């Protein structure tokens, strides 16, 4: 890699975030403000997305 190369020959850093978006238990999680739990009422819910 030479700094005077044309853009297509210049170095690019690449990162590839690969998700195991499966039925398994979660450990990497979005910054959501969790609530107290509610039961026996009809409710909206979001468990681990």
């Amino acid at each position: 890699f030479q700094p005077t190369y044309g853009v297509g020959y210049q170095p690019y850093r690449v990162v590839v975030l690969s998700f195991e978006l499966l039925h398994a238990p979660a450990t990497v999680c979005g910054p959501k403000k969790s609530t107290n739990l509610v039961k026996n009422k009809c409710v909206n819910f979001n468990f681990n997305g």
Partner: peptide
């Protein structure tokens, strides 16, 4: 040497609970 495996080597195919069902 060899022997018969019978029914052995079944495993839970995914981490989902299921009950009273014949899943395929």
């Amino acid at each position: 040497a060899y022997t018969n495996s019978f029914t052995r080597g079944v495993y839970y195919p995914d981490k989902v609970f299921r009950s009273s069902v014949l899943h395929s």
